[PDB]
Design a protein around this ligand. Structure first.
Ligand code: 0CK
Length: 287
């Protein structure tokens, strides 16, 4: 595709479209390629990546076009997702590694919101570690479920609206999202908070619930989230994690979250333990 890309073998899937590990035959570098059958979302989603280009932890779009019966989008090659690394460590991260990750993730989320969009799908799978030198960097991906929360010019927030359906992953979804309220910034962060406790515990307490309907399991998850007080969810761990989640749940619909305060929370715990930010994650010490 594109006269300079050698399509490759599939390495995965996004919210829509499929992903392949190709090679930019001209620059001699591996890349990942997303394809969409001509006949529509790719072209729309590519325009969102284009608006995100530049940020720390935001993959770069190399090409976008059509080849035969497919519309194509090409990007730089990234490493394992956080879900994959977590699995490679026996689903056990040291306190030092959880804190290292928390810091960067709060940051990618802040960046997206800065661009008039809300992700609406924060999970370990949409966070990929870079390769090689870029191995100490956490990346964020997929803007297929993204929506503009404010007018690029007026910053006029979208109308508070109800009876909206869930667009994302139930396990990490916010309580308000469960109640059918329009999604906003606060919801992307609450999601991260659950992701961090998942890293400390191995799983979350509303994981593995069951229902006949996808719709009925989403509500059982809602019921259990609403029934698990934060001091219980975080027992046996540094108080900082409980403090973080309580902060997210108190945010108003069109409020702008205090990102910095959150990061500072974890940094202080980091020091009392005597840790250093050398990016030696648990996975790096493996032999
Ligand atoms: N390794 C790697 N490097 C860069 C991007 C992606 C990628 C894309 C993706 C998005 C836009 C695009 F142009 C090209 C690829 N969608 C999902 N993934 C992954 C999710 C985790 C499991 C493996 C696939 N994967």
């Amino acid at each position: 595709v594109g006269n300079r890309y050698r399509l490759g073998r599939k390495i995965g899937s996004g919210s829509f479209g499929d992903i392949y590990l190709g090679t930019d035959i001209a620059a001699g570098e591996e890349v990942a390629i997303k394809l969409e059958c001509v006949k529509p979302q790719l072209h729309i989603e590519s325009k969102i990546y284009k608006m995100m280009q530049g940020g720390v932890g935001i993959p770069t779009i190399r090409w976008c076009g059509a080849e035969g019966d497919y519309n194509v989008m090409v990007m730089e090659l990234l490493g394992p997702s956080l879900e994959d690394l977590f699995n490679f460590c026996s689903r056990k991260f040291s306190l030092k590694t959880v804190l290292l990750l928390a810091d960067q993730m709060i940051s990618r989320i802040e960046y997206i919101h800065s661009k008039n969009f809300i992700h609406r799908d924060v999970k370990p799978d949409n966070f990929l570690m870079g390769l090689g030198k870029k191995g100490n960097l956490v990346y964020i991906i997929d803007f297929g479920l993204a929506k503009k929360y404010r007018d690029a010019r007026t910053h006029q927030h979208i109308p508070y609206r109800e009876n909206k359906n869930l667009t994302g992953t139930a396990r990490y979804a916010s309580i308000n999202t469960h109640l059918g309220i329009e999604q906003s910034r606060r919801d992307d962060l609450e999601s991260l908070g659950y992701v961090l406790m998942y890293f400390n515990l191995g799983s979350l307490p509303w994981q593995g619930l069951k229902a006949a309907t996808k719709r009925q399991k989403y509500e059982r998850i809602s019921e259990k989230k609403m029934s698990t007080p934060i001091e219980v969810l975080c027992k046996g761990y540094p108080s900082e994690f409980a403090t973080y989640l309580n902060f997210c749940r108190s945010l108003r619909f069109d409020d702008k979250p205090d990102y910095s305060y959150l990061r500072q929370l974890f940094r202080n715990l980091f020091h009392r333990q005597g840790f250093s930010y050398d990016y030696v994650f648990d996975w790096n010490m493996l032999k």
